[PDB]
Design an enzyme around this catalytic site. Structure first.
Site, PDB file in Angstrom:
ATOM      1  N   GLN D  11      94.763  -4.861  -1.849  1.00 22.23           N
ATOM      2  CA  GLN D  11      95.464  -5.577  -0.787  1.00 22.23           C
ATOM      3  C   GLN D  11      94.553  -5.818   0.407  1.00 22.23           C
ATOM      4  OE1 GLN D  11      99.061  -3.736   0.587  1.00 22.23           O
ATOM      5  NE2 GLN D  11      99.560  -5.423   1.978  1.00 22.23           N
ATOM      6  N   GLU D  63      99.708  -5.439  -8.118  1.00 19.64           N
ATOM      7  CA  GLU D  63     101.042  -5.659  -7.581  1.00 19.64           C
ATOM      8  C   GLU D  63     101.205  -7.128  -7.226  1.00 19.64           C
ATOM      9  OE1 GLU D  63     101.441  -3.113  -4.219  1.00 19.64           O
ATOM     10  OE2 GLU D  63      99.715  -3.940  -3.147  1.00 19.64           O
ATOM     11  N   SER D 132      89.207  -2.281  -0.487  1.00 19.23           N
ATOM     12  CA  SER D 132      89.520  -1.075   0.258  1.00 19.23           C
ATOM     13  C   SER D 132      89.265   0.131  -0.630  1.00 19.23           C
ATOM     14  CB  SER D 132      90.969  -1.091   0.731  1.00 19.23           C
ATOM     15  OG  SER D 132      91.275   0.111   1.410  1.00 19.23           O
ATOM     16  N   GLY D 136      93.921   3.332  -4.923  1.00 18.55           N
ATOM     17  CA  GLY D 136      93.601   3.557  -6.316  1.00 18.55           C
ATOM     18  C   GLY D 136      93.194   2.286  -7.029  1.00 18.55           C
ATOM     19  N   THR D 137      93.971   1.218  -6.834  1.00 19.22           N
ATOM     20  CA  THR D 137      93.642  -0.052  -7.470  1.00 19.22           C
ATOM     21  C   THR D 137      92.260  -0.530  -7.055  1.00 19.22           C
ATOM     22  OG1 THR D 137      94.681  -1.322  -5.698  1.00 19.22           O
ATOM     23  CG2 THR D 137      96.063  -0.658  -7.543  1.00 19.22           C
ATOM     24  N   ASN D 198      88.367   1.518   9.935  1.00 16.65           N
ATOM     25  CA  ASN D 198      89.284   0.785  10.804  1.00 16.65           C
ATOM     26  C   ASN D 198      89.276   1.268  12.248  1.00 16.65           C
ATOM     27  OD1 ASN D 198      90.115  -0.772   8.644  1.00 16.65           O
ATOM     28  ND2 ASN D 198      91.920   0.487   8.214  1.00 16.65           N
ATOM     29  N   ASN D 220      90.881  -8.503  10.154  1.00 20.51           N
ATOM     30  CA  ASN D 220      90.373  -9.430   9.156  1.00 20.51           C
ATOM     31  C   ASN D 220      89.625 -10.594   9.795  1.00 20.51           C
ATOM     32  OD1 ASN D 220      91.773  -7.855   7.158  1.00 20.51           O
ATOM     33  ND2 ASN D 220      93.645  -8.926   7.768  1.00 20.51           N
ATOM     34  N   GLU D 246      66.597 -11.161   0.714  1.00 16.92           N
ATOM     35  CA  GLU D 246      65.769 -10.591   1.770  1.00 16.92           C
ATOM     36  C   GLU D 246      66.545  -9.526   2.548  1.00 16.92           C
ATOM     37  OE1 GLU D 246      62.625 -11.126   2.173  1.00 16.92           O
ATOM     38  OE2 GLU D 246      62.409  -9.966   4.028  1.00 16.92           O
TER      39      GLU D 246
HETATM   40  N1  GTP Z   1      90.954  -3.190   7.591  1.00 17.66           N
HETATM   41  C1  GTP Z   1      91.918  -3.311   6.686  1.00 17.66           C
HETATM   42  N2  GTP Z   1      92.252  -2.235   5.888  1.00 17.66           N
HETATM   43  C2  GTP Z   1      93.234  -2.348   4.965  1.00 17.66           C
HETATM   44  C3  GTP Z   1      93.911  -3.544   4.810  1.00 17.66           C
HETATM   45  N3  GTP Z   1      94.828  -3.380   3.837  1.00 17.66           N
HETATM   46  C4  GTP Z   1      94.740  -2.116   3.368  1.00 17.66           C
HETATM   47  N4  GTP Z   1      93.766  -1.461   4.067  1.00 17.66           N
HETATM   48  C5  GTP Z   1      93.333  -0.070   3.863  1.00 17.66           C
HETATM   49  O1  GTP Z   1      93.451   0.254   2.493  1.00 17.66           O
HETATM   50  C6  GTP Z   1      93.900   1.581   2.331  1.00 17.66           C
HETATM   51  C7  GTP Z   1      94.737   1.714   1.064  1.00 17.66           C
HETATM   52  O2  GTP Z   1      94.379   0.733   0.114  1.00 17.66           O
HETATM   53  P1  GTP Z   1      95.183  -0.657   0.101  1.00 17.66           P
HETATM   54  O3  GTP Z   1      94.243  -1.824   0.267  1.00 17.66           O
HETATM   55  O4  GTP Z   1      96.207  -0.627   1.205  1.00 17.66           O
HETATM   56  O5  GTP Z   1      95.942  -0.728  -1.312  1.00 17.66           O
HETATM   57  P2  GTP Z   1      95.132  -1.127  -2.636  1.00 17.66           P
HETATM   58  O6  GTP Z   1      93.657  -1.244  -2.361  1.00 17.66           O
HETATM   59  O7  GTP Z   1      95.693  -2.412  -3.189  1.00 17.66           O
HETATM   60  O8  GTP Z   1      95.431   0.070  -3.661  1.00 17.66           O
HETATM   61  P3  GTP Z   1      96.946   0.320  -4.124  1.00 17.66           P
HETATM   62  O9  GTP Z   1      97.737   0.736  -2.911  1.00 17.66           O
HETATM   63  O10 GTP Z   1      96.990   1.405  -5.170  1.00 17.66           O
HETATM   64  O11 GTP Z   1      97.527  -0.958  -4.674  1.00 17.66           O
HETATM   65  C8  GTP Z   1      94.691   1.900   3.587  1.00 17.66           C
HETATM   66  O12 GTP Z   1      94.403   3.206   4.022  1.00 17.66           O
HETATM   67  C9  GTP Z   1      94.218   0.901   4.621  1.00 17.66           C
HETATM   68  O13 GTP Z   1      93.457   1.561   5.602  1.00 17.66           O
HETATM   69  C10 GTP Z   1      93.577  -4.630   5.603  1.00 17.66           C
HETATM   70  O14 GTP Z   1      94.182  -5.690   5.479  1.00 17.66           O
HETATM   71  N5  GTP Z   1      92.585  -4.510   6.548  1.00 17.66           N
HETATM   72 MG    MG Z   2      97.498  -1.346  -2.652  1.00 22.71          MG
END
Ligand code: GTP
Ligand code: MG
Ligand code: GTP
Ligand code: GDP
Ligand code: GDP
Ligand code: MG
Lengths: 430, 49, 49, 431, 47, 430, 434
Positions: D11, D63, D132, D136-137, D198, D220, D246
């Site tokens: 996400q 998802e 991120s 997990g994903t 963050n 973002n 480079e």
């Molecule tokens: N800077 C920033 N961090 C994000 C964003 N979305 C999620 N995160 C970070 O990602 C971490 C968790 O992973 P997510 O990206 O939310 O979820 P995911 O990577 O899809 O993994 P799943 O939850 O299992 O589906 C959180 O602790 C957030 O700090 C975003 O839009 N911007």
């Molecule tokens: Mg997620």
């Protein structure tokens, strides 16, 4: 007649040529379309030295442009006077060297250089009576610093008797733009000393003190740099192209400058340089010009020439003058500064006169000086290179495609031996 | 008897701006200005259960 | 001989005179550029509030 | 002839890809529909033959929500409809799920799409990957994709822009586990990694932009600006160009050390932007000053190894060199003894663009900095401590065990982190 | 706020005084002088 | 030929030169843009003494303006005739000395003198046949008093045979502006006595007195004082530039005025000076010129010559006059005041005549007198110095950068010894 | 290319900084919004910095822990002039507690202040020095002044710093605890300031009553007078003059020994418009009014001691001959005597820019003015009375717990009183003849 082909590689060399060709075209009165519009008949007597004739009465430069990324070539073609270049002579790669000397000398260079060697061979066989080759490149970049040297070796292996000239830009520690400069600088000098007949060292920082101090202009630019360096390189061979009181060509300079085969590294300088705001106060005279090129400030190199002693000096004058006060000033300055002149080679100054000045100027001079001061650049490069190498930092990139640390050790030892042998004559006594 | 360095000291005109506002630079980045927004805005509440 | 010597004067004077206008025009145009750029943040302020 | 492929997973990866793609299209003048109303877009897009353009990007998620919102958003017509891989079941922050159960059925389709993209490609410089790490994903799919690409293409360069959990701010409670696992995975597989936690970005947007209420969208937007300043040189002419190749010749002294932290300048609101000259000296000093670091780290506790800075606008090389001389004169910033000069500099003519409705103001001169310094060990140390605290009593371990990967794998990740810490300590000492 | 307002207030004097400070203020004698060599008046062509 | 180069440092010397150059330019008929517009041919043959020819047919003064604060010459450029000065000859620092002899002689000056020495070597070395150097400076200020004498010594080692003249403004306690004047005056005169071939002392108190009593003008100004010193300077070297009955140059003056090598501190006077209200009543005659010569109040030094005995006298006359009443009036004045002339040097007056007068005055006089009266200046400044020094007042500023009290003690001892040796000859009888 | 940085800390410092910044903008012709109106250069570079196009930014910093005054400034008519985030404010005031302002809460503001100092100093190339403004009778003022002086002395080194401190009047006072933090602050600044000047309020009150004919003065008039003194001192840097004087040319002339660097000033003429044009205001008359002891800006009687030095800045169209003639008469007068080892003790400066008037103020157009700064042995009396007041209080250890409970240790007062005694002995031993 006794013509020379031009070849350049790398971004720095391409930019250098982009202004060298422009300035020489101005000198010979050629428009960007390749049609003659000059005024003097002398401008066309010796046009064959750098230009070939095609149907319709037009001229083409005998330049060979080589690079590993087509962006610079596409940028330079669209520039002014970019249409003069023959489309066939352009050769470029699709990947690039990435400032890696091993990449630009081993892995892709052997594959790419066959075509450029074929085209330069065609150009060499085409001309009436070849005089030599001149190359412009930078030692701080991988593709230039590797390809130029390997091409030098190849061309020397084919023409053992022709003359070899190089304009090499060296990386100074004050203005550093890439962290891997010492490696490819040492690797390049190792090969360069072995084959180049003449090398002239050029430093941005020296250029830059010149541009801030003499011209006093607020905003220097790469174009202004290229202009200075192009004027300097045009001055050396102007006398080859035009009449004069005392003609003197590249072979003349070669015989008169290097006492020993390995001491062929020079610094050059151009005069006069004045600010446009002070142009009216200054008076163009021979003594003023001679003090002007002998100033340590105007020198194109970071080395301080008063920290050592001159092996020899040479000056080329452009404009209408008599030899009297010229030779008189040469003798006068040699008497006055005997401490900075080595004593076992008396009368170590060459003078050349050409009757035509550059366009826009009445007097001009190009100075070439072989002096002991060059050791400082190689010393600082050695310190930086060994500080890098002792920790084996940034080494696996070079080692990953056939090169080994034995070659680096040999390069360092050979360059240090060059420094020692060069400073040997500094304190030699008769 | 002049070298390249130590010669730029001489003042000419106002182009010393590009070369000497950091002569005595008053150190630098030695000071901590992390999360000092505490004064500009208002702090979030911090309560015991 | 004295004639070309007297002749050079006006070439030099016209050259320096022309260079002075080149000096002035650059400053004038950069002033205008900074002016329009600053005035653009005025629209930015209006957009933000 | 110059192009690069972007991969988005998780996400966070998708919400950063969306932000960077608004900026990309607005910079190149392409409308949201994809129709333009000489060739600079070939880096990021490809001509359809007549009319519109398609991005060279791929989006993956398990998802369906975020892919669905993208496919119902204003950018319906832009992306290639079959390049938005949407799943059915989330891994739910579980690294094992995304690395051993559901990634296996994803990876074949994903590689097929990447191969279809690459066949159109001709001058591939490399790949960017966005994920991120605290999910997990994201972690599992990133591990799988990097593992397969490293063997499928080999020497092609890949850049990973990972968003690490903050030292003390975090959303989930299991993110240290999958974070360490992903570190072990990517250490020997990613050419260059950039830290993007963050908390530092929150601090930046609080201090400089002067918004008392930002969300993920502003974060973002900042990341998109950084990426644009990074990749401008590939598609815009400049007095001194730089390629992605480079970086591995300038920023990584040893193959193990390839984690860097970034910074950007100037960051300022329109209420006080041009009311100061914002000259090169000020922007490059703000760049090296410790507050504007995109990562929650203090460079003053360690040495610097290599700094690479890209300027865009009307900057003058003499300006940048005068700044560099003063910086080397500076005392508080100290470099490692085996690197006298460690600065790589790039310059581009095209000034940064502004997204309508955004926060940043437009200025002529901008600088984006990638720094490799020895101070990066502290985040690894604190993550290791957090991991050991919860692994001391085998907390949550049964969820990962019950997905099919063995018990021992945590031990090797711990040992690899210990080796990384020792390596940084050893390279940090003077000879 | 009562005391402190934006007010309307609106170098030639400085230049005039500066040149006055460098001025002569007493000049010198009045000029009857015409340049002539000493040994030239005595020695002249004769018929 | 036998030309001299002008060098000044400090704002006081800069102001002195700003008027000296204007008066000499008015004498030679040169407009502020440097183009000749003279009427007679006599104005051009000897223009090489103080000017160099440049392209564009104009003339540039051979002056070196050196200092450590940019404002003073940034101001002098805006003044009239400020365009004559060549831009490259401006050399100055950015910090200044703040009226500190030690700072101007050890810390900043030692570093800065490199460029000014280079440019002085330039100008002295370009001259065909060098005659000597002249410097103008004030001894009440730290930077001037220190760096001027340092460069004086440095020029002295490299040119021992050339003539050296110094125009020194010494602090007078009646009108003082600074509290640290005695320290720097003593420290500076200590080296000046060892190196300067000629030193003319000038006193602001005496110039104010002259403007009050002779000119009877209400408000004297710095311009007035500068004009007086400028006319005095011009009268010394007028005969060098113009023909006359008896040519007399600086070397001849030095031979005929100095009995012993350590006695080279002179006082000078100019004539005639009168209120322009009284100009009509004046009768310009040689006896009047001599009586205004030998008047005590005409002298620009506070030392009363009737408190001592004249060692030597020298007179330079400008205008067309016959030697008859010149020598006759000189002999009559010598006999009439025999007690004020020391006896063992009979016929102790040198006379010189040049027939070209200054602009405005039909006949003019420059007078130089070596007498025992100057001892009182050194006595009073030494009294001030010891009053300052016995309490260690204002001392740690000078000690904070390498100078110790040993140099202070040596300087005061040397000053006292010179005073004693100077007054020794006052009572000498044969 | 010459610059100098100004620091204002404390409520008095803020109210005098705003006062002087009105006058300086008025003198340079800059409108209150900062924009150049209508359409001779680099006269504002001394105190301002150009934004590249249009307005100017002052080279000042404002510090306070109680943000009422700062909020007033940010909502006032000069809202667009100052940089929006150099007006640094805390949350709780020191409440006249020196320990609070030196150990408890100032440590969290000093870092940001020094960061701002860096961000201002990096933009200057010929930095002449620092001016600091602070009242001594305030807790936060004294504490932050001490902390800033300590930090800057080690961070910068040899730069000159000038303190325009406002000591409490001998018998007229606002608070009751101010002797304590005054002694502590003077101890702190003795080894840290190159030059300090006296600015006690009662002398200014008396001047306003006697000459300005104001029977009811307020802080505004005092602040305007102090601003005029600042302008007179600094006019030499930004205006051409026959005998220019720089900031670095003070510690070489006015402070005979390192420990002695406290001086007291005067300004002349002080007069109202309805009577100013009634007299010629000659240079001799104004220079006699300058040495008039009742016109001392600090209520200290010079007749009780010897003089070491006097530095006098004239502005207008005065003539050096007239200045010298007046100095001769001053030397001739017998009621003023100098110390024996100082025969000549005058430093003179001249500038042409006549003093500017603030419309709605009290001053008028006068084409001549002079400001004198004197170092004399008489200043020891204020130290003596301050020491006596401190001893009266420390006899019974009153109010001591308010400083002890803030982490500031008990014995701190001892070496402060010892250093005051040492300074008094230094003055006594200097004042004797050899
Ligand atoms: N800077 C920033 N961090 C994000 C964003 N979305 C999620 N995160 C970070 O990602 C971490 C968790 O992973 P997510 O990206 O939310 O979820 P995911 O990577 O899809 O993994 P799943 O939850 O299992 O589906 C959180 O602790 C957030 O700090 C975003 O839009 N911007
Ligand atoms: Mg997620
Ligand atoms: N001359 C003058 N002195 C002032 C002014 N305002 C306050 N003072 C002096 O300052 C002393 C107390 O400090 P303040 O300036 O009131 O406030 P502060 O310096 O910030 O210290 P705190 O009150 O603890 O916050 C008093 O004894 C006054 O004499 C003023 O406007 N003019
Ligand atoms: N004088 C000059 N130097 C240049 C120019 N372009 C680049 N350089 C210098 O060349 C160095 C980099 O060389 P590089 O481009 O890597 O050489 P290449 O690898 O052969 O293309 C930089 O340090 C620049 O200072 C130019 O147009 N003129
Ligand atoms: N005649 C004359 N004397 C001047 C002038 N300017 C300054 N002075 C003298 O110079 C003395 C001060 O010198 P000072 O400033 O200390 O010299 P510095 O150390 O080079 O700055 C004063 O006593 C003045 O009498 C001027 O324009 N004309
Ligand atoms: Mg208060």
């Amino acid at each position: 007649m006794r013509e020379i082909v031009h070849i350049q590689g790398g971004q720095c060399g391409n930019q250098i040529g982009a202004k060298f060709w422009e300035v020489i075209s101005d000198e010979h009165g050629i428009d960007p379309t390749g049609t003659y519009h000059g005024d003097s008949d002398l401008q066309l007597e010796r046009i064959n030295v750098y230009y070939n004739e095609a149907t319709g009465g037009r001229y083409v430069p005998r330049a060979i442009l080589m690079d590993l990324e087509p962006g610079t070539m596409d940028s330079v073609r669209a520039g002014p006077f970019g249409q003069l270049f023959r489309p066939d002579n352009f050769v470029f790669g699709q990947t690039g060297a990435g400032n890696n000397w091993a990449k630009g000398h081993y892995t892709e260079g052997a594959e790419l250089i066959d075509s450029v060697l074929d085209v330069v061979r065609k150009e060499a066989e085409g001309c009436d009576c070849l005089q030599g080759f001149q190359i412009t490149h930078s030692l701080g970049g991988g593709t230039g610093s590797g390809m130029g040297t390997l091409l030098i070796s190849k061309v020397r292996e084919e023409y053992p008797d022709r003359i070899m000239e190089t304009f090499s830009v060296v990386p100074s520690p004050k203005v550093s733009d890439t962290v891997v400069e010492p490696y490819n600088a040492t690797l390049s000098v190792h090969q360069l000393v072995e084959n180049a007949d003449e090398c002239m060292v050029i430093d941005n920082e020296a250029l830059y003190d010149i541009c801030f101090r003499t011209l006093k202009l607020t905003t220097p630019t790469y174009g202004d740099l290229n202009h200075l360096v192009s004027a300097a390189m045009s001055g050396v061979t102007c006398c080859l192209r035009f009449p004069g009181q005392l003609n003197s060509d590249l072979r003349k300079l070669a015989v008169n400058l290097i006492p020993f085969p390995r001491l062929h590294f020079f610094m050059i300088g151009f005069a006069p340089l004045t600010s446009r705001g002070s142009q009216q106060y200054r008076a163009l005279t021979v003594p003023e010009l001679t003090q002007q090129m002998f100033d340590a400030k105007n020198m194109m190199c970071a080395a301080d020439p008063r920290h050592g002693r001159y092996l020899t000096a040479s000056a080329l004058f452009r404009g209408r003058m008599s030899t009297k006060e010229v030779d008189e000033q040469m003798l006068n300055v040699q008497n006055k500064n005997s401490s900075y002149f080595v004593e076992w080679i008396p009368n170590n100054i060459k003078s050349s006169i050409c009757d035509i000045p550059p366009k826009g100027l009445k007097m001009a001079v190009t100075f070439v000086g072989n002096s002991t001061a060059i050791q400082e650049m190689f010393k600082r490069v050695a310190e930086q290179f060994t500080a890098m190498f002792r920790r084996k930092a940034f080494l696996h990139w070079y080692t990953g495609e056939g090169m080994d640390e034995m070659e680096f050790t040999e390069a360092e030892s050979n360059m240090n031996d060059l420094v020692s042998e060069y400073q040997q004559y500094q304190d030699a006594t008769a | 008897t002049a070298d390249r360095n130590k010669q730029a000291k001489v003042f000419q005109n106002k182009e010393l701006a590009k070369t000497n506002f950091a002569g005595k630079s008053s150190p630098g980045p030695a000071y901590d200005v992390r999360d000092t927004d505490y004064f500009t805005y208002q702090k979030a509440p911090k309560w015991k259960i | 001989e004295k004639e070309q010597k007297e002749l050079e004067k006006d070439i030099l004077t016209k050259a320096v005179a022309a260079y002075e206008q080149e000096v002035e025009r650059k400053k004038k145009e950069l002033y205008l550029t900074n002016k329009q750029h600053q005035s653009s943040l005025i629209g930015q302020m209006h957009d933000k509030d | 002839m110059r192009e690069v492929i972007s991969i988005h997973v998780g996400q966070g990866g998708i919400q950063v890809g969306n932000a960077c793609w608004e900026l990309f299209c607005l910079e190149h003048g392409i409308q949201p529909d994809g129709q333009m109303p000489d060739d600079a877009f070939n880096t990021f897009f490809s001509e359809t033959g007549a009319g519109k353009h398609v991005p060279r990007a791929v989006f993956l998620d398990l998802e369906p929500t975020v892919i669905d919102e993208v496919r119902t958003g204003t950018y319906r017509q832009l992306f290639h409809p079959e390049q938005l891989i949407s799943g059915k079941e989330d891994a739910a922050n579980n690294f094992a799920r995304g690395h051993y159960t559901i990634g296996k059925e994803i990876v074949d389709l994903c590689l097929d799409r990447i191969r279809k993209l690459a066949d159109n490609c001709t001058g591939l410089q490399g790949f960017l990957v966005f994920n991120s790490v605290g999910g997990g994903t994201g972690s599992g799919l990133g591990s799988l994709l990097l593992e397969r690409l490293s063997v499928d293409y080999g020497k092609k360069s890949k850049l990973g822009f990972t968003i690490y959990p903050s030292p003390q701010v975090s959303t989930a409670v299991v993110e240290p586990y999958n974070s360490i696992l992903s570190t072990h995975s990517l250490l020997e597989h990613t050419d260059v990694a950039v830290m993007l936690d963050n908390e530092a970005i929150y601090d930046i947007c609080r201090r400089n932009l002067d918004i008392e209420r930002p969300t993920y969208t502003n974060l973002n937007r900042l990341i998109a600006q950084v990426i644009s300043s990074l990749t401008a040189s590939l598609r815009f002419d400049g007095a001194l160009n730089v390629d992605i190749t480079e970086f591995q010749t300038n920023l990584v002294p040893y193959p193990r050390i390839h984690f860097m932290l970034s910074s950007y300048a100037p960051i300022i609101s329109a209420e006080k932007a041009y009311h100061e000259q914002l000259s090169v000296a000020e922007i490059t000093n703000s760049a090296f000053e410790p507050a504007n670091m995109m990562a929650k780290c203090d460079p003053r506790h360690g040495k610097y190894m290599a700094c690479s800075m890209m300027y865009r606008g009307d900057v003058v090389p003499k300006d940048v060199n005068a700044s560099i001389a003063t910086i080397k004169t500076k005392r508080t910033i100290q470099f490692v003894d085996w690197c006298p000069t460690g600065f790589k500099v790039g310059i581009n003519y095209q000034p940064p663009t502004v997204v309508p409705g955004g926060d940043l103001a437009k200025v002529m001169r901008a600088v984006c900095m990638i720094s490799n310094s020895t101070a990066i060990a502290e985040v690894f140390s604190r993550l290791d401590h957090k991991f050991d605290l919860m692994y001391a009593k085998r907390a949550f371990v049964h969820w990962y065990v019950g997905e099919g990967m063995e018990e021992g794998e945590f031990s090797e990740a711990r040992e690899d982190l210990a080796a990384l810490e020792k390596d940084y300590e050893e390279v940090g000492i003077e000879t | 706020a009562k005391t402190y307002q934006g007010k309307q207030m609106f170098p030639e004097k400085i230049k005039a005084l500066s040149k006055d400070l460098r001025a002569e203020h007493f000049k010198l004698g009045n000029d009857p002088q015409s340049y002539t060599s000493e040994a030239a008046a005595k020695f002249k062509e004769f018929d």
